[PDB]
Amino acid sequence: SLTHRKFGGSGGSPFSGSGSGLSSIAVRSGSYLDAIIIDGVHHGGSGGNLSPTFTFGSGEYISNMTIRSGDYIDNISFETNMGRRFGPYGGSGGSANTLSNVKVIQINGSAGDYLDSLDIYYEQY
């Protein structure tokens, strides 16, 4: 069943993922998530360090995700259905929330200098 969940604060300007799906993800992070790079498109600032890009294989998707957040996105980590891991990247602030047994289909959000928020569209199993 398809649903969505917002994480983080109220600031920044809105962005969207590609629209249908999600082919690759990288982040910039320090103490917080500075940026999320979705399908090669940058959303957020130029601070922090750039992660390697995670590129989803055929039949591969985000299945479990842990996000630390307060007013911003502090940390992102995920696992896929193929057992691959991304992160954790970011700091230790905020509070943790986990999507468990999902299939993420799109990531939208809001950003300025940092990644303020994410709105994750996923199938909840």
PDB file of C-alpha atoms in Angstrom:
ATOM      1  CA  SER A   1       0.000   0.000   0.000  1.00  0.00           C
ATOM      2  CA  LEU A   2       1.290   3.404  -1.050  1.00  0.00           C
ATOM      3  CA  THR A   3       1.814   6.134   1.481  1.00  0.00           C
ATOM      4  CA  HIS A   4       4.294   8.894   2.384  1.00  0.00           C
ATOM      5  CA  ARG A   5       6.013  10.351   5.426  1.00  0.00           C
ATOM      6  CA  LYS A   6       7.670  13.702   6.069  1.00  0.00           C
ATOM      7  CA  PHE A   7      10.868  14.047   8.118  1.00  0.00           C
ATOM      8  CA  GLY A   8      12.609  17.263   9.259  1.00  0.00           C
ATOM      9  CA  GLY A   9      11.619  20.896   9.632  1.00  0.00           C
ATOM     10  CA  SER A  10       9.599  23.543   7.848  1.00  0.00           C
ATOM     11  CA  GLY A  11      12.326  25.523   6.044  1.00  0.00           C
ATOM     12  CA  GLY A  12      13.917  25.538   2.613  1.00  0.00           C
ATOM     13  CA  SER A  13      12.362  25.553  -0.849  1.00  0.00           C
ATOM     14  CA  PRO A  14      10.609  22.500  -2.311  1.00  0.00           C
ATOM     15  CA  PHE A  15      12.183  20.024  -4.668  1.00  0.00           C
ATOM     16  CA  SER A  16      11.072  16.763  -6.202  1.00  0.00           C
ATOM     17  CA  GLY A  17      12.729  13.647  -7.336  1.00  0.00           C
ATOM     18  CA  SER A  18      12.532  12.636 -11.012  1.00  0.00           C
ATOM     19  CA  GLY A  19       8.795  11.774 -10.739  1.00  0.00           C
ATOM     20  CA  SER A  20       8.314   8.142 -11.435  1.00  0.00           C
ATOM     21  CA  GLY A  21      11.227   6.521  -9.590  1.00  0.00           C
ATOM     22  CA  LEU A  22      14.691   6.669  -8.153  1.00  0.00           C
ATOM     23  CA  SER A  23      17.807   5.555 -10.062  1.00  0.00           C
ATOM     24  CA  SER A  24      20.647   6.921  -7.908  1.00  0.00           C
ATOM     25  CA  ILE A  25      21.369   8.723  -4.657  1.00  0.00           C
ATOM     26  CA  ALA A  26      24.325  10.542  -3.222  1.00  0.00           C
ATOM     27  CA  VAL A  27      24.478  12.975  -0.280  1.00  0.00           C
ATOM     28  CA  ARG A  28      26.660  15.815   1.061  1.00  0.00           C
ATOM     29  CA  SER A  29      26.895  15.566   4.825  1.00  0.00           C
ATOM     30  CA  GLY A  30      28.744  16.899   7.844  1.00  0.00           C
ATOM     31  CA  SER A  31      26.876  17.335  11.098  1.00  0.00           C
ATOM     32  CA  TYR A  32      23.735  17.409   8.998  1.00  0.00           C
ATOM     33  CA  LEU A  33      22.696  16.448   5.533  1.00  0.00           C
ATOM     34  CA  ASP A  34      23.831  19.451   3.416  1.00  0.00           C
ATOM     35  CA  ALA A  35      22.436  18.049   0.169  1.00  0.00           C
ATOM     36  CA  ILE A  36      20.784  15.091  -1.488  1.00  0.00           C
ATOM     37  CA  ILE A  37      21.736  14.291  -5.091  1.00  0.00           C
ATOM     38  CA  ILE A  38      18.915  12.344  -6.777  1.00  0.00           C
ATOM     39  CA  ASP A  39      19.461  10.878 -10.214  1.00  0.00           C
ATOM     40  CA  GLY A  40      22.486  13.201 -10.583  1.00  0.00           C
ATOM     41  CA  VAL A  41      20.525  16.364  -9.665  1.00  0.00           C
ATOM     42  CA  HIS A  42      21.767  18.347  -6.646  1.00  0.00           C
ATOM     43  CA  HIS A  43      19.337  19.610  -4.000  1.00  0.00           C
ATOM     44  CA  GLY A  44      20.813  21.600  -1.062  1.00  0.00           C
ATOM     45  CA  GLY A  45      24.091  23.373  -0.286  1.00  0.00           C
ATOM     46  CA  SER A  46      27.754  22.860  -1.016  1.00  0.00           C
ATOM     47  CA  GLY A  47      28.948  22.210   2.565  1.00  0.00           C
ATOM     48  CA  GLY A  48      30.000  18.884   3.996  1.00  0.00           C
ATOM     49  CA  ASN A  49      31.620  15.969   2.172  1.00  0.00           C
ATOM     50  CA  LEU A  50      30.242  14.261  -0.947  1.00  0.00           C
ATOM     51  CA  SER A  51      29.335  10.564  -0.576  1.00  0.00           C
ATOM     52  CA  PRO A  52      29.745   8.036  -3.345  1.00  0.00           C
ATOM     53  CA  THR A  53      26.694   7.563  -5.492  1.00  0.00           C
ATOM     54  CA  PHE A  54      24.498   4.543  -4.855  1.00  0.00           C
ATOM     55  CA  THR A  55      22.937   3.243  -8.097  1.00  0.00           C
ATOM     56  CA  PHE A  56      19.989   0.855  -7.795  1.00  0.00           C
ATOM     57  CA  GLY A  57      20.232  -2.414  -9.712  1.00  0.00           C
ATOM     58  CA  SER A  58      17.378  -3.991 -11.598  1.00  0.00           C
ATOM     59  CA  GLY A  59      14.778  -5.195  -9.071  1.00  0.00           C
ATOM     60  CA  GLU A  60      16.579  -3.284  -6.280  1.00  0.00           C
ATOM     61  CA  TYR A  61      14.973  -0.703  -4.040  1.00  0.00           C
ATOM     62  CA  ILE A  62      15.203   0.928  -0.593  1.00  0.00           C
ATOM     63  CA  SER A  63      13.512  -1.495   1.834  1.00  0.00           C
ATOM     64  CA  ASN A  64      14.481  -0.187   5.288  1.00  0.00           C
ATOM     65  CA  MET A  65      15.512   3.405   6.086  1.00  0.00           C
ATOM     66  CA  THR A  66      16.599   5.236   9.250  1.00  0.00           C
ATOM     67  CA  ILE A  67      16.464   9.035   9.269  1.00  0.00           C
ATOM     68  CA  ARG A  68      17.596  11.270  12.158  1.00  0.00           C
ATOM     69  CA  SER A  69      15.923  14.654  11.979  1.00  0.00           C
ATOM     70  CA  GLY A  70      14.933  17.761  13.938  1.00  0.00           C
ATOM     71  CA  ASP A  71      14.631  21.078  12.135  1.00  0.00           C
ATOM     72  CA  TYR A  72      16.849  19.560   9.403  1.00  0.00           C
ATOM     73  CA  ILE A  73      17.729  16.079   8.229  1.00  0.00           C
ATOM     74  CA  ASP A  74      20.635  15.097  10.481  1.00  0.00           C
ATOM     75  CA  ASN A  75      21.446  11.569   9.235  1.00  0.00           C
ATOM     76  CA  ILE A  76      20.303   9.099   6.548  1.00  0.00           C
ATOM     77  CA  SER A  77      20.986   5.414   6.266  1.00  0.00           C
ATOM     78  CA  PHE A  78      19.255   2.732   4.253  1.00  0.00           C
ATOM     79  CA  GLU A  79      19.276  -0.890   3.194  1.00  0.00           C
ATOM     80  CA  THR A  80      17.984  -2.441   0.003  1.00  0.00           C
ATOM     81  CA  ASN A  81      16.117  -5.679  -0.684  1.00  0.00           C
ATOM     82  CA  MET A  82      19.432  -6.950  -2.120  1.00  0.00           C
ATOM     83  CA  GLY A  83      21.130  -6.466   1.270  1.00  0.00           C
ATOM     84  CA  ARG A  84      23.181  -3.399   0.263  1.00  0.00           C
ATOM     85  CA  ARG A  85      23.671  -0.512   2.687  1.00  0.00           C
ATOM     86  CA  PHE A  86      24.009   3.245   2.168  1.00  0.00           C
ATOM     87  CA  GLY A  87      25.374   5.353   5.032  1.00  0.00           C
ATOM     88  CA  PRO A  88      24.974   6.228   7.742  1.00  0.00           C
ATOM     89  CA  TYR A  89      25.888   9.734   6.671  1.00  0.00           C
ATOM     90  CA  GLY A  90      25.491  12.809   8.859  1.00  0.00           C
ATOM     91  CA  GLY A  91      25.628  13.579  12.518  1.00  0.00           C
ATOM     92  CA  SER A  92      24.170  12.354  15.758  1.00  0.00           C
ATOM     93  CA  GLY A  93      21.547  15.083  16.406  1.00  0.00           C
ATOM     94  CA  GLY A  94      17.813  14.985  16.014  1.00  0.00           C
ATOM     95  CA  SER A  95      15.684  11.945  16.711  1.00  0.00           C
ATOM     96  CA  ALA A  96      15.629   8.673  14.840  1.00  0.00           C
ATOM     97  CA  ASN A  97      12.691   7.299  12.862  1.00  0.00           C
ATOM     98  CA  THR A  98      12.725   4.130  10.748  1.00  0.00           C
ATOM     99  CA  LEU A  99      10.776   2.901   7.776  1.00  0.00           C
ATOM    100  CA  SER A 100      10.670  -0.848   8.014  1.00  0.00           C
ATOM    101  CA  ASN A 101       9.618  -3.370   5.347  1.00  0.00           C
ATOM    102  CA  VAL A 102       8.949  -0.775   2.628  1.00  0.00           C
ATOM    103  CA  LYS A 103       9.640  -0.080  -1.013  1.00  0.00           C
ATOM    104  CA  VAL A 104      10.610   3.566  -1.549  1.00  0.00           C
ATOM    105  CA  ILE A 105       9.340   4.832  -4.879  1.00  0.00           C
ATOM    106  CA  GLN A 106      10.127   8.587  -4.707  1.00  0.00           C
ATOM    107  CA  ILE A 107      11.998  11.101  -2.563  1.00  0.00           C
ATOM    108  CA  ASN A 108      10.859  14.741  -2.495  1.00  0.00           C
ATOM    109  CA  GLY A 109      11.860  17.365   0.087  1.00  0.00           C
ATOM    110  CA  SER A 110      12.823  20.923   0.857  1.00  0.00           C
ATOM    111  CA  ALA A 111      16.282  22.455   0.972  1.00  0.00           C
ATOM    112  CA  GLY A 112      18.268  25.663   1.280  1.00  0.00           C
ATOM    113  CA  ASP A 113      21.809  25.634   2.602  1.00  0.00           C
ATOM    114  CA  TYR A 114      20.985  22.243   4.163  1.00  0.00           C
ATOM    115  CA  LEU A 115      18.446  19.508   3.614  1.00  0.00           C
ATOM    116  CA  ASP A 116      15.564  20.814   5.773  1.00  0.00           C
ATOM    117  CA  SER A 117      13.134  17.983   5.063  1.00  0.00           C
ATOM    118  CA  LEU A 118      12.325  14.891   3.072  1.00  0.00           C
ATOM    119  CA  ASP A 119       8.880  13.580   1.979  1.00  0.00           C
ATOM    120  CA  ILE A 120       9.393   9.933   1.207  1.00  0.00           C
ATOM    121  CA  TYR A 121       6.823   8.108  -0.962  1.00  0.00           C
ATOM    122  CA  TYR A 122       6.828   4.391  -0.304  1.00  0.00           C
ATOM    123  CA  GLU A 123       4.858   1.186  -0.340  1.00  0.00           C
ATOM    124  CA  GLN A 124       4.336  -0.008   3.239  1.00  0.00           C
ATOM    125  CA  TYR A 125       4.266  -3.782   3.572  1.00  0.00           C
TER     126      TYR A 125
END
